[PDB]
Motif scaffolding. Structure first.
Motif, short mmCIF file in Angstrom:
data_model
loop_
_atom_site.label_atom_id
_atom_site.label_comp_id
_atom_site.label_asym_id
_atom_site.label_seq_id
_atom_site.Cartn_x
_atom_site.Cartn_y
_atom_site.Cartn_z
N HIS A 1 1.04 -1.07 -0.09
CA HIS A 1 -0.14 -0.26 -0.02
C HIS A 1 1.18 1.29 0.01
N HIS B 1 2.00 3.71 1.71
CA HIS B 1 2.69 4.47 3.58
C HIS B 1 4.13 4.11 2.96
N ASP C 1 6.61 2.71 5.06
CA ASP C 1 6.94 1.50 5.15
C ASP C 1 7.32 0.59 3.97
N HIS D 1 -6.92 -1.25 7.17
CA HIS D 1 -5.65 -0.61 7.41
C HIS D 1 -5.66 0.62 6.74
N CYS E 1 0.39 -4.49 6.60
CA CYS E 1 0.21 -3.75 7.45
C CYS E 1 -1.57 -4.51 8.25
N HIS F 1 4.05 -5.07 10.88
CA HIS F 1 4.21 -4.20 12.37
C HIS F 1 4.56 -5.27 13.40
O LIG Z 1 1.66 1.21 7.59
#
Ligand SMILES: [O-]
Ligand SMILES: [Zn+2]
Ligand SMILES: [Zn+2]
Length: 239
Positions: A90, A92, A94, A159, A178, A220
């Motif tokens: 996605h 983001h 990270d 998420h 995530c 995570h």
């Molecule tokens: O994230």
């Protein structure tokens, strides 16, 4: 003394530069990279590396180009095979923070079409290719050429609106990214981009998509068994 990477990884997780690598199966490793938050602990994020015959496949960048270049250094040093393609899960930091490093290495990159739409607005770089998903969540095969063991599934918004997931055929592994946290998590992390209405259902959809996956790998949390999926849905229920 010239042990294989598998032989070396029997000693446990291996630090490499600012990253950590863990062997999950004979041809699958977890990459971990860290975002320093000044005055707090560094935020870990996990992705995957898959050796598929004479080529390597990557799931997710590290937080930055530099950290992603470190991943590519590790692959060269320990696997010594070319990286063919990457799937990123996605828009983001990270997951897509290192796209420029992948592209410069000649790696072909794939993301949910929606991730590619969202990324440039956010100061990130889109993947080179867009994945489209059938209404049932499975990637339209025409948009995912030569993915080998990677089976890509869109579980619905959770998420983030664009989050996607990846099963590894021929192994016990499915990557929730995530969307999923482990069975002892007290928090789902930052829900600022989350669809709180649909999150629980999307976590459930992921579990139902990969019913044989007994090892759930996550961004995570460390890998866990399937109870991570219903634990996450419970934490997400009626937010
Ligand atoms: O994230
Ligand atoms: Zn995220
Ligand atoms: Zn994340």
């Amino acid at each position: 003394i010239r042990p294989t990477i598998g032989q070396q990884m029997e000693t446990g997780d291996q630090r490499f530069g600012d990253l950590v690598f863990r062997q999950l199966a004979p041809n699958v490793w977890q990459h971990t990279s860290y975002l320093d938050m000044p005055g707090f602990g560094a935020v870990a994020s996990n992705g995957l590396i898959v050796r598929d015959g004479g080529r390597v496949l990557v799931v997710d960048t590290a937080w930055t180009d530099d950290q992603t270049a470190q991943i590519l250094n590790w692959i060269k040093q320990e696997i010594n095979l070319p990286v063919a393609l990457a799937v990123v899960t996605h828009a983001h930091q990270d997951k897509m923070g290192g796209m420029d490093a992948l592209h410069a290495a000649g790696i072909a990159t794939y993301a949910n079409a929606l991730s590619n739409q969202l990324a440039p607005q956010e100061g990130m770089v889109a993947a080179q290719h867009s994945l489209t998903f059938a209404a049932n969540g499975w990637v339209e095969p025409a948009t995912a050429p030569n993915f080998g063991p990677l089976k890509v599934f869109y579980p619905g918004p959770g998420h983030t609106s664009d989050n996607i997931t990846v099963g590894i055929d021929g192994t016990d592994i499915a990557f929730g990214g995530c969307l999923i946290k482990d069975s002892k998590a007290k928090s789902l992390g930052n829900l600022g981009d989350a669809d709180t209405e649909h999150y629980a259902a999307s976590a459930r959809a992921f579990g139902a998509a990969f019913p044989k996956a007994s090892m759930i790998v996550m961004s995570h949390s460390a890998p866990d068994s399937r109870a991570a999926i219903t634990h996450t849905a419970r934490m997400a229920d009626k937010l």
